[PDB]
Write a protein that binds this ligand. Structure first.
Ligand SMILES: C/C=C(/C)C(=O)O[C@H]1C(C)=C2[C@H]([C@@H]1OC(=O)CCCCCCC)[C@@](C)(OC(C)=O)C[C@H](OC(=O)CCC)[C@@]1(OC(=O)CCC)[C@H]2OC(=O)[C@@]1(C)O
Ligand SMILES: [K+]
Length: 994
């Protein structure tokens, strides 16, 4: 395996010591394979349903629950025969929760798809090699190809390994590197080595990357690297080495787990410390077993009271909902947990072309020199109407319409555009529109031609179909395209050698038409065509040319410029070696400049404002383009990244400038920069790590497989709907319309989702707090079980689940985007809020406990044990002659529990209205504000009633319907909550900073 692109064909045949005609010898193959491994990507990690299930049972809370599920299962295995049969329902349900919860997580991971797996979609199953053991070519399994052995590839074939090309068996070799480099059009390959050893893939012209397809031709080559060593394998590793943090809310959930675990434990010690006097009791097992059974069944209750068993159910459903809501807005969220992290984006890095702009190129300014008379000079600027690739528009000089033909200079310019260009136009009748056939920038020159047909060649009486390439093919027939010197990033330009065809044109026969970067080509021009004549390119004329070139790329226009020239006396045909990108630059010299063409890549409508939104939303936007920084910066001003007069010294760098900086300034640059032009692949990944060293949540756009590494490392990777599949499977979200503004839209829903999501979480949590309080008093005072595990779960999964999810539909704040990005480390409940719930729980804990006790003593239905130890109720059948002239079974009664459970239920509907706003009073933000809320509160209540009356139910919950007067008591207990909160809110509102 090597750096073959820089090495020559021999040197490579040398390195591996393999014969180009024999290939590797069967021995060499065994040796080579055992030294370089199979040419395949690392096997998938092996996870079992077992590990997958065990993982479900790793969470701390899930464990705490599983444990209690047993204390319960055992406790229920100790009931009194017929005194109870429903005994086994408490433990059975907790399991269903855990069983359910597991089933979810799994059916969650089986349906998951690995971004690293997608890559294997680019590995052909078979390949063709030439080995010593046979005369003719052999079609083996890609996996068995080895670095060194000879391989031949042809059209259709997907490249197997990273190959250095030895000799092209065809006239030309075209490849589709789209995925790995991002060049839609098939490029041309050669055999000559590339000097630079640190070259980027795009410039390795003698290289075949594994996974890309061969568009046209047939060639032979020696395998540079295989497996994880190839260009794609290097990506697989960056991705496999990339580790992703958990959603801040996912973190908070682990945080809350550890903590709950502590508290519960302390509660136990406290409770025990409370009933310490028991160490001063007569020594004899007077319910030694009846007392332990008691605590254990309080243990299980305490557990289901501290864990919000319906919260993950609610979050998952709120995420799924908003998700669809976004799908509507072209924002396709792949991972639900992300809708949150999205909301916290503080930096968005977007590619320019496809997403910030339309990528619908069009030329709207031309200019040909009009006169050179020493120092005096005058150009001929023009403007061209139309943004579409449609052959409709006109040409104007000072806004005044013109027939292009009248200018000789334009007749030349025009041809160059049709001849040099490989792209073309087509018109699909189904959609009734003109379509770009080749590349955006060339296919533009195509429509430019059409719109200015120099010869007036009448075409009006044509259909749109044929109208598409009319004026080009006109010029296509004039000259004969002999051969083309393709584009090369060194000389930044391409050309075409042309013959006159039919005689009478013989004189000035062979010509050479060039088009490339202005500074580039113009430095190679010794002449300038003024009409049909020519004149020595002089300094004055050159300054004037390069001056206009800058107003066009730097001015409010933000235009990309193409210099069009011509070599009048092109080197003799045979004196040219048409297969070495290196010499083409030398063949494209001694040129006479004819004129430049400025085209535009209009920004999308909804982009301007989207950029403004981010300003208000405190989100930094960083552009990633291919433009030079001169125009890059212009485009950045045009859309809003920069002000029109804003300084941009240390806020816009280029791929080189950046690299030329020491790791320190490099880092410093990233916290201020916004426009990054002509950026290599490595970069996207460095810019992310730096933005991260500043604790920022960044978003990164990408389309091809080369972006996957970056995408997988950005907090939120955004892939293009039109982009590769690997790219998509590597990103958290996809943009159907590839439109950047869709990003901003997505981010806004994230802030909206987390806002509502935020509340129902605070809501379900407080209720769990109050539930615990109840249990704590129940045991701290030795009272009869006010609330039972079975009941609690119902209230936690259903009675509170409905109000909870509904709170997820709270009307979004109007200013959501006028506030900076949320801090991930922001806790959900602290400070003053901590205290309110500290107080609310403290309340319901009292309301629930007391509600039940009040039935025992003080009620007309219940036996007033009033102001007498209801508490020592356990020692009762024995001690009855003392303080017990009644039946020791009242305590098992349902009325009492059915009391607390009702006060709990009504207090949780009340606390659901208080959760409509953290600090706004209901008198201000009335409950009717969120209809869904009220609706569910009804569904909930009726559900509560259901389990009270419908016969089968009451029995298992240990609940007996209570009459019209007991109910009124529930109200006198619950309702005060609303007031307690209004007060506590008023405090926040008024005094405490707020
Ligand atoms: C389920 C409620 C029980 C009774 C409880 O013990 O929870 C407490 C504790 C886990 C939280 C605390 C809990 O604190 C309290 O209950 C104190 C115990 C009261 C004693 C009652 C007697 C039996 C949370 C629930 O508290 C509030 C008032 O509801 C608030 C906060 O949690 C939230 O952010 C939810 C996160 C998803 C936590 O805050 C703490 O105060 C910080 C501790 C270092 C919680 O602790 C953290 O994990 C936080 C940030 O999540
Ligand atoms: K990621």
């Amino acid at each position: 395996m090597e750096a073959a692109h820089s090495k020559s064909t021999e040197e490579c045949l040398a390195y591996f010591g393999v014969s180009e005609t024999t290939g590797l010898t069967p021995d060499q193959v065994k040796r080579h394979l055992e030294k370089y491994g199979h040419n395949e990507l690392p096997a998938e990690e092996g996870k079992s349903l077992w590990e997958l299930v065990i993982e479900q049972f790793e969470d701390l809370l899930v464990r705490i629950l599983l444990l209690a599920a047993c204390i319960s299962f055992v406790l229920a295995w100790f009931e009194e025969g017929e005194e109870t049969i429903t005994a086994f329902v408490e433990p059975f349900v907790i399991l269903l929760i855990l069983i359910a919860n597991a089933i979810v997580g799994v059916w969650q991971e089986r349906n998951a798809e690995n971004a690293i797996e997608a890559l294997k979609e680019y590995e052909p199953e078979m390949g063709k090699v030439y080995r010593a053991d046979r005369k003719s070519v052999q079609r083996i399994k890609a996996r068995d190809i080895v670095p060194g052995d000879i391989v031949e590839v042809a059209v259709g074939d997907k490249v197997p390994a990273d190959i250095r090309i030895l000799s092209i068996k065809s006239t030309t070799l075209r490849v589709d590197q789209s995925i790995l480099t991002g060049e839609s059009v098939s490029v041309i390959k050669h055999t000559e080595p590339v000097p630079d050893p640190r070259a980027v893939n795009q410039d390795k012209k003698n290289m075949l990357f594994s996974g890309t397809n061969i568009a046209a031709g047939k060639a032979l080559g020696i395998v540079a690297t295989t497996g994880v060593s190839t260009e794609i394998g290097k990506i697989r590793d960056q991705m496999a080495a990339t580790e992703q943090d958990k959603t801040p809310l996912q973190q908070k959930l682990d945080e809350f787990g550890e903590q709950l675990s502590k508290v519960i434990s302390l509660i136990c010690v406290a409770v025990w410390l409370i009933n310490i006097g028991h160490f001063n009791d007569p020594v004899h097992g007077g319910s030694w077993i009846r007392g332990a059974i008691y605590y254990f069944k309080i243990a299980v209750a305490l557990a289901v009271a501290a864990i919000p068993e319906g919260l993950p159910a609610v979050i998952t459903t709120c995420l799924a909902l908003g998700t669809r809501r976004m799908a509507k807005k072209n924002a396709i969220v792949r991972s639900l947990p992300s809708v949150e992290t999205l909301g916290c984006t503080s930096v968005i890095c977007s590619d320019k072309t496809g997403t910030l702009t339309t990528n619908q190129m069009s030329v709207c300014k031309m200019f040909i020199i009009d006169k050179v008379d020493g120092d005096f000079c005058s150009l001929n600027e023009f403007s061209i109407t139309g943004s579409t690739y449609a052959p409709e528009g006109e040409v104007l000089k000072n806004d005044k319409p013109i027939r292009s033909g009248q200018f000789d200079g334009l007749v030349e310019l025009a041809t160059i555009c049709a001849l040099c260009n490989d792209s073309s136009l087509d018109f699909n009748e189904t959609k009734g529109v003109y379509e770009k056939v080749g590349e955006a920038t060339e296919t533009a020159l195509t429509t430019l031609v059409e719109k200015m047909n120099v010869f007036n060649t009448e075409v009006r009486n044509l259909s749109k179909v044929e109208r598409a390439n009319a004026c080009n093919s006109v010029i296509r027939q004039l000259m004969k395209k002999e051969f083309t010197l393709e584009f090369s990033r060194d000389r930044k330009s391409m050309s075409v050698y042309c013959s006159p065809a039919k005689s009478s044109r013989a004189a000035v026969g062979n010509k050479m038409f060039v088009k490339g970067a202005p500074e580039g080509v113009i430095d190679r021009c010794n002449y300038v065509r003024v009409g049909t004549t020519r004149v020595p390119m002089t300094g004055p004329v050159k300054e004037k040319i390069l001056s206009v070139i800058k107003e066009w790329g730097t001015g409010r226009d933000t235009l990309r410029c193409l210099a069009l020239a011509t070599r009048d006396t092109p080197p003799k045909r045979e004196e040219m070696v048409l297969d070495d990108s290196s010499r083409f630059m030398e063949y494209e010299t001694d040129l006479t400049f004819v004129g430049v063409v400025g085209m535009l890549d209009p920004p999308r409508k909804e982009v301007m404002g989207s950029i403004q939104l981010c300003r208000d939303a405190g989100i930094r936007v960083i552009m990633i383009t291919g433009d030079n920084k001169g125009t890059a910066i212009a485009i950045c001003r045009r859309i809003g990244i920069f002000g029109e007069n804003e300084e941009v010294a240390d806020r816009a760098y280029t791929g080189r400038e950046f690299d030329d900086l020491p790791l320190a300034e490099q880092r410093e640059a990233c916290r201020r920069a916004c426009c990054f032009a002509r950026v290599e692949p490595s970069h996207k990944s460095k810019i992310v790590e730096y933005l991260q060293s500043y604790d920022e949540i960044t978003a990164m756009t990408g389309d091809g497989v080369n972006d996957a590494p970056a995408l997988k490392k950005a907090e939120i990777g955004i892939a293009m709907g039109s982009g590769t599949a690997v790219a998509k499977t590597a990103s958290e979200m996809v943009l159907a319309d590839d439109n950047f503004s869709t990003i901003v839209a997505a981010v806004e829903e994230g802030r909206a989702i987390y806002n509502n999501m935020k509340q129902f979480i605070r809501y379900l949590i407080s209720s769990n707090v109050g539930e615990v309080v109840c249990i704590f008093l129940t045991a701290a005072l030795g009272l009869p079980e006010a609330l039972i595990p079975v009941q609690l779960l119902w209230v936690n999964l259903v009675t509170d689940g409905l109000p909870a999810t509904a709170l997820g539909f709270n009307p979004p704040d109007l200013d959501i985007m006028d506030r900076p990005p949320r801090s991930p480390k922001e806790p959900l409940i602290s400070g003053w809020l901590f205290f309110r719930y500290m107080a609310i729980g403290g309340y319901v804990g009292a309301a629930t406990v007391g509600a039940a006790a009040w039935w025992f003593m003080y009620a007309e239905d219940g036996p007033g044990v009033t102001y007498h130890q209801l508490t020592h109720f356990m020692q009762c059948t024995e001690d009855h002659p003392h303080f017990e002239g009644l039946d020791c079974e009242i305590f098992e009664a349902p009325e009492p529990m059915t009391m607390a459970l009702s006060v709990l239920v009504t207090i949780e509907m009340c606390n659901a209205l208080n959760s409509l706003s953290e600090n706004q009073s209901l008198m201000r933000m009335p409950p009717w504000v969120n209809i869904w809320l009220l609706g569910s509160i009804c569904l909930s209540m009726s559900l509560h009633f259901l389990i009270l009356y419908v016969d089968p139910l009451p029995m298992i919950f240990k609940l007996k319907a209570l009459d019209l007067t007991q109910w009124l008591m529930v109200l006198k207990i619950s309702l005060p909550v609303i007031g307690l909160d209004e007060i506590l809110k008023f405090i926040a509102r008024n005094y405490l900073e707020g």
